Structure formats: C-alpha cells, structure tokens
PDB file of C-alpha atoms in Angstrom:
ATOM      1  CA  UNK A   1      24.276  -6.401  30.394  1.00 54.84           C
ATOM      2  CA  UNK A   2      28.468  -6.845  30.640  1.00 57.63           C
ATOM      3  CA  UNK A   3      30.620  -8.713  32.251  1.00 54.55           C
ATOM      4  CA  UNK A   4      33.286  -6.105  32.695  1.00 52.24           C
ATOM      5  CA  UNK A   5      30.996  -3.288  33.065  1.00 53.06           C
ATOM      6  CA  UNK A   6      29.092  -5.329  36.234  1.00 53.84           C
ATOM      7  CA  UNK A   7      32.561  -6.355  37.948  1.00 54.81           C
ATOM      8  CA  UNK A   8      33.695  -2.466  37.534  1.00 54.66           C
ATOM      9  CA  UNK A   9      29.887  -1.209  39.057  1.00 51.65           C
ATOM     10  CA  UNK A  10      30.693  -3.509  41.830  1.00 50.37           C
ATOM     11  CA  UNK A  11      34.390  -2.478  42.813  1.00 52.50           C
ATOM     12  CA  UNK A  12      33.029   1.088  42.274  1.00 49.50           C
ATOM     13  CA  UNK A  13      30.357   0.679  44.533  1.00 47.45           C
ATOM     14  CA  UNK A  14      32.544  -0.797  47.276  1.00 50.30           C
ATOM     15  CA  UNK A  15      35.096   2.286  47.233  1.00 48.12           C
ATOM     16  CA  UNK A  16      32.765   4.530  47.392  1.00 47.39           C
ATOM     17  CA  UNK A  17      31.000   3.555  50.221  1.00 48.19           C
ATOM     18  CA  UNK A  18      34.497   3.164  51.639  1.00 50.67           C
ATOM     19  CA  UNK A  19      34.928   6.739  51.083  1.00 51.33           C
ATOM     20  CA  UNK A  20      31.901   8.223  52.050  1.00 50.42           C
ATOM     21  CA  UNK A  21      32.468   6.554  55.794  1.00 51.50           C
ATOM     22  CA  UNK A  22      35.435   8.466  56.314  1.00 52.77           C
ATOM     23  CA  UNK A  23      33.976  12.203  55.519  1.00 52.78           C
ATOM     24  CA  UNK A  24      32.764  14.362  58.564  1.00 52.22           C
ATOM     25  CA  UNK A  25      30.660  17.195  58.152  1.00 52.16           C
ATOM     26  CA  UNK A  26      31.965  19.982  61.007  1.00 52.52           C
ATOM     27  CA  UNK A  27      35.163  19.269  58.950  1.00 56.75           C
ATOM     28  CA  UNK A  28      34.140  19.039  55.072  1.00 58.42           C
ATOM     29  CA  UNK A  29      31.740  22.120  55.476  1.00 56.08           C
ATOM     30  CA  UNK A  30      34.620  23.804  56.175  1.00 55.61           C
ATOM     31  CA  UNK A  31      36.583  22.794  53.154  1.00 53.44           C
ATOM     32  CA  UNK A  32      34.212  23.213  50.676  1.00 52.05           C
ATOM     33  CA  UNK A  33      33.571  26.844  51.847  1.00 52.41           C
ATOM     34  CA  UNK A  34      37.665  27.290  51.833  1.00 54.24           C
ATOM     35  CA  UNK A  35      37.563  25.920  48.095  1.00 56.27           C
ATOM     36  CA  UNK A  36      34.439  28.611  47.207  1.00 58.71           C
ATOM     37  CA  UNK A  37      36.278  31.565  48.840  1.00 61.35           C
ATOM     38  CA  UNK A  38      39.400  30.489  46.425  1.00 60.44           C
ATOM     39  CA  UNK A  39      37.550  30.205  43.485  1.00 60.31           C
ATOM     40  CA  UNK A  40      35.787  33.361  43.848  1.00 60.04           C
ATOM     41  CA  UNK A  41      39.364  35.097  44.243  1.00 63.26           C
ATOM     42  CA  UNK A  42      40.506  33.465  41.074  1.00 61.74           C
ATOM     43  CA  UNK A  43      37.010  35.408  39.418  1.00 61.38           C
ATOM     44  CA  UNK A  44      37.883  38.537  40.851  1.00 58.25           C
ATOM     45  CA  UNK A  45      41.183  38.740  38.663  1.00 61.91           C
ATOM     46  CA  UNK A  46      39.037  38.158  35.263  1.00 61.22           C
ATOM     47  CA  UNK A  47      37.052  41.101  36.339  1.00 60.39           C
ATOM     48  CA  UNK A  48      40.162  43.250  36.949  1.00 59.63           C
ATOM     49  CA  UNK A  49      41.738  42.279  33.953  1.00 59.26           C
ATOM     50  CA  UNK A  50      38.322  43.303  31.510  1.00 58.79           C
ATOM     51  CA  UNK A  51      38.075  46.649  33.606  1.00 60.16           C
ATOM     52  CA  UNK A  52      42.014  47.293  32.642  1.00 63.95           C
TER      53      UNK A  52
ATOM     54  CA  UNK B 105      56.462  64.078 -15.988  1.00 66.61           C
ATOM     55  CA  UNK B 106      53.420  62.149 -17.323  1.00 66.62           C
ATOM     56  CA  UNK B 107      54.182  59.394 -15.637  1.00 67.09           C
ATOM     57  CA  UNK B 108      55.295  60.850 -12.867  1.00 69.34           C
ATOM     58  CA  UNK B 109      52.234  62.025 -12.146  1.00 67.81           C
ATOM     59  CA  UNK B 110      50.499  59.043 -11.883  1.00 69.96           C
ATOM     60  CA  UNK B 111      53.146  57.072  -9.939  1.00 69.46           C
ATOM     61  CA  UNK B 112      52.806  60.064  -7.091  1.00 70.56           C
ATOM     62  CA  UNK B 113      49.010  58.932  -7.337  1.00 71.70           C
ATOM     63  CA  UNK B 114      49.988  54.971  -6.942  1.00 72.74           C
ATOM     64  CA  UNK B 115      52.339  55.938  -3.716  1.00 75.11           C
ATOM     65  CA  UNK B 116      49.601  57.955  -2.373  1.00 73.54           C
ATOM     66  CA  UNK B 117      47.007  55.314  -2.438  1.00 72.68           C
ATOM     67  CA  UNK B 118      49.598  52.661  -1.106  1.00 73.13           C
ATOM     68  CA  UNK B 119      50.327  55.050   1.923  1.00 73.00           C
ATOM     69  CA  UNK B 120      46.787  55.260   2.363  1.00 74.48           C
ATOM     70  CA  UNK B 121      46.195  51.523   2.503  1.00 78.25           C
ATOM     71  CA  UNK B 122      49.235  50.857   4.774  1.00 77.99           C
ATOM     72  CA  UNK B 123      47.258  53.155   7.867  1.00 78.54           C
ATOM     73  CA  UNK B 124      44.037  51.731   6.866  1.00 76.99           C
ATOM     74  CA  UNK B 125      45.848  48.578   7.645  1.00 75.39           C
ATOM     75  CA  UNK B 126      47.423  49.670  10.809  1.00 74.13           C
ATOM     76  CA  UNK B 127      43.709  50.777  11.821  1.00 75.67           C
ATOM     77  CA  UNK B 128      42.270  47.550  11.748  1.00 77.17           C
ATOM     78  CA  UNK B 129      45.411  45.549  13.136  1.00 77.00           C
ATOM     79  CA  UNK B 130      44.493  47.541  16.423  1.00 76.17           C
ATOM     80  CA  UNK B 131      40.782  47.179  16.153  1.00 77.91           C
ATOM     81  CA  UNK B 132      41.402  43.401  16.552  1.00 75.88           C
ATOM     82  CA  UNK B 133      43.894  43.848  19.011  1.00 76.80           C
ATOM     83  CA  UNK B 134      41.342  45.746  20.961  1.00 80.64           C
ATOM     84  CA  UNK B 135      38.623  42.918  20.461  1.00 77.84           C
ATOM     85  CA  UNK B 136      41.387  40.423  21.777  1.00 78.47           C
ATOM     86  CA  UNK B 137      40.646  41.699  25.229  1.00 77.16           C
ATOM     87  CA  UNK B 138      37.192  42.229  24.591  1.00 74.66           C
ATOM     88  CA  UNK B 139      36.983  38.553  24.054  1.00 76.71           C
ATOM     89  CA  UNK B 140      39.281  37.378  27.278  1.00 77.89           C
ATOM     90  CA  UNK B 141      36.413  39.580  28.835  1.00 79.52           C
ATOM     91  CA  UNK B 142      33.989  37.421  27.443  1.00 80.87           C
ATOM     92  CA  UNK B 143      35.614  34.110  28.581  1.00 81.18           C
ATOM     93  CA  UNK B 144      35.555  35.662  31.864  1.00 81.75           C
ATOM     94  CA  UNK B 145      31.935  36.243  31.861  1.00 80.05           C
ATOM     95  CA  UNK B 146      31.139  32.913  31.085  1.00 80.35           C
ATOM     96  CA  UNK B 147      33.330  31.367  34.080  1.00 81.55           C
ATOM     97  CA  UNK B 148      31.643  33.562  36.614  1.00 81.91           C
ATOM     98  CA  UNK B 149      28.251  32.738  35.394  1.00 81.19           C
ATOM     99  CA  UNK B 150      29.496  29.006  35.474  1.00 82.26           C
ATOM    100  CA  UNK B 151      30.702  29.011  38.855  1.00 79.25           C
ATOM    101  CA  UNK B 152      26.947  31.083  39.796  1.00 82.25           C
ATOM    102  CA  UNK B 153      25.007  28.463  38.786  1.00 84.40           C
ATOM    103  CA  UNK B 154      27.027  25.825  40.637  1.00 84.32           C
ATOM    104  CA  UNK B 155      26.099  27.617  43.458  1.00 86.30           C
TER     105      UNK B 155
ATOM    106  CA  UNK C 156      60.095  54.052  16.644  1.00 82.88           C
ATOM    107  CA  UNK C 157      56.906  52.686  18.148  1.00 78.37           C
ATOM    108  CA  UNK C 158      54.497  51.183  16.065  1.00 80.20           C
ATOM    109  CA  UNK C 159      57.417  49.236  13.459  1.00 77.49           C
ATOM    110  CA  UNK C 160      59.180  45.736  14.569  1.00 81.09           C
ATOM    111  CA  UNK C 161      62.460  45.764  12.033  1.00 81.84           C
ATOM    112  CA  UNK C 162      64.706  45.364  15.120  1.00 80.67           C
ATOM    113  CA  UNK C 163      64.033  42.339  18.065  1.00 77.36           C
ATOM    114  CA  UNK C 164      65.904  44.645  20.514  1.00 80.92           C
ATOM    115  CA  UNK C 165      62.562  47.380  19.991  1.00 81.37           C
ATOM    116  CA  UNK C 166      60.443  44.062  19.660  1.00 78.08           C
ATOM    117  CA  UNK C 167      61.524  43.179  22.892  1.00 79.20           C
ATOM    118  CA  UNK C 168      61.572  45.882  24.380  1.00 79.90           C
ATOM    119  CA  UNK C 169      58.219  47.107  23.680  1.00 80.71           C
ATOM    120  CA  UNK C 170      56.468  43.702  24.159  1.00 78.62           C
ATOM    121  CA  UNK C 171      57.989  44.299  27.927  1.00 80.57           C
ATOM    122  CA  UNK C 172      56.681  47.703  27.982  1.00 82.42           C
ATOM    123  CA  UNK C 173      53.630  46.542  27.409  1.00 81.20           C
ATOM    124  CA  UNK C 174      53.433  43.653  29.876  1.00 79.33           C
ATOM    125  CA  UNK C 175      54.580  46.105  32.958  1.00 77.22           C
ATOM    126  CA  UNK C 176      51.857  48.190  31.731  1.00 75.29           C
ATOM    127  CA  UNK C 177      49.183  45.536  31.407  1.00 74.96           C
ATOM    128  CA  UNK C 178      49.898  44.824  34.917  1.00 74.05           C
ATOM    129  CA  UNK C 179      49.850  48.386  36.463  1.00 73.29           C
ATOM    130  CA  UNK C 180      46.371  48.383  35.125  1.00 74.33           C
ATOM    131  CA  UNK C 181      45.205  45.129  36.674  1.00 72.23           C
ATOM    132  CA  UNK C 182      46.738  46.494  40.217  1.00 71.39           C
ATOM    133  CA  UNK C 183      44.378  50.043  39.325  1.00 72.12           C
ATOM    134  CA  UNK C 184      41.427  48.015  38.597  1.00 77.73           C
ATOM    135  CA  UNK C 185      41.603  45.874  41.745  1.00 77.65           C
ATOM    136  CA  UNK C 186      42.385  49.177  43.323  1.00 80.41           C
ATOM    137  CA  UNK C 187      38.982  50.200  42.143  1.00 76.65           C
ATOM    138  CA  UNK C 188      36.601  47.001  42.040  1.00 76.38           C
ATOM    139  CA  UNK C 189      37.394  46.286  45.687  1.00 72.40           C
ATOM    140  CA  UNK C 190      36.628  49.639  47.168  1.00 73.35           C
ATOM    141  CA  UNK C 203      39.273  70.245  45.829  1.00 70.90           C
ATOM    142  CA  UNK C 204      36.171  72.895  46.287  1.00 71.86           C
ATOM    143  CA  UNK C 205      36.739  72.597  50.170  1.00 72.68           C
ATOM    144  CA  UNK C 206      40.536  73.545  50.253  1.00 71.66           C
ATOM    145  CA  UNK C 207      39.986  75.527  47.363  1.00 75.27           C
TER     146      UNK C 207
END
C-alpha cells in the first residue's frame, strides 16, 4: 500500500517489541490490580453522589 | 370598578403562572441529578465489561 | 428571601449553602453504601 504508512508500521513494530521486553509479570500484575482498585474508588463516589 | 375587576382577574392568573413556573424550574433541577446518576451508571457498566 | 436572586450577596450565599449541603450528603451516603424497644 504506502510508503509512509509501511515506514511508520515498521518503527512501530520495533518499539513495541522494545517495550514489551522490559515488562515483568510478578511486577505488572501488581499494577494493573493497583490501577482497578483506584478506579473502582473513583465509581464508588458516582454512587454516593446519586444516593444523595 | 369594571375594570377593576378584570385587572384583579389578569394579576391572579399572572401569580398563578409565576409558581407554575417555579414548579417546573425545580422539576428540572431535580432531573439534573437524575441525569449525573445516569452518567454514572453508564461508567460503572463500562468499567464491568472491561473486566 | 430564599427562592429570589435580586441581590449577588443572597446569590452567593445560597449557592454556598447549597454546596456545603451537597457535600454533607455525599459524606451520609458513603456513610451508608459502605456499611429503642430494649431500653425502652
């Protein structure tokens, strides 16, 4: 297809194998349940304000 | 006093719409919150199916 | 008077009121969503 497009897939490609080297599971698991508990506090103050 | 009469009956029905007024100003001050309620709703059910 | 907004100061003032309140409700409603026959 492109020109531009194909160069871009490339350089995408290459970062994000660059990326997905550096995570670690023990550690990630971790943060993505931090993230959940956070956004499930920012629900519970929605449901406070419709029961007001 | 004729005419009296019927501008007593124009100031009545102006007092009359001016609550009516009020009334409704409130009812959609109520839904307001109703609606934020709503909104709410939809985020949790967003961040359920994420899940 | 309550329900009229001729004068900021009352405008103001009661859009305050209102906000304190607001937010003594959210505290109840956390209070609740969260978790006298005897001595009579």
């Amino acid at each position: 297809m492109g020109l531009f497009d194909r160069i871009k897939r490339v350089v995408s490609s290459n970062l994000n194998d660059l990326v997905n080297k550096a995570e670690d599971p023990e550690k990630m698991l971790e943060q993505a349940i931090l993230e959940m508990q956070e956004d499930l506090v920012q629900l519970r103050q929605g449901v406070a304000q419709a029961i007001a | 006093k004729a005419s009296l009469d019927t501008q007593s009956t124009q100031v009545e029905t102006l007092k009359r719409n001016l609550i009516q007024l009020e009334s409704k100003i409130s009812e959609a001050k109520t839904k307001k919150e109703m609606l934020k309620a709503r909104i709410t709703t939809a985020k949790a059910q967003e961040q359920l199916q994420g899940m | 008077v309550r329900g009229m907004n001729t004068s900021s100061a009352m405008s103001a003032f009661e859009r305050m009121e209102e906000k304190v309140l607001m937010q003594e409700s959210r505290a109840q409603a956390l209070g609740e969503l969260a978790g006298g026959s005897d001595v009579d």
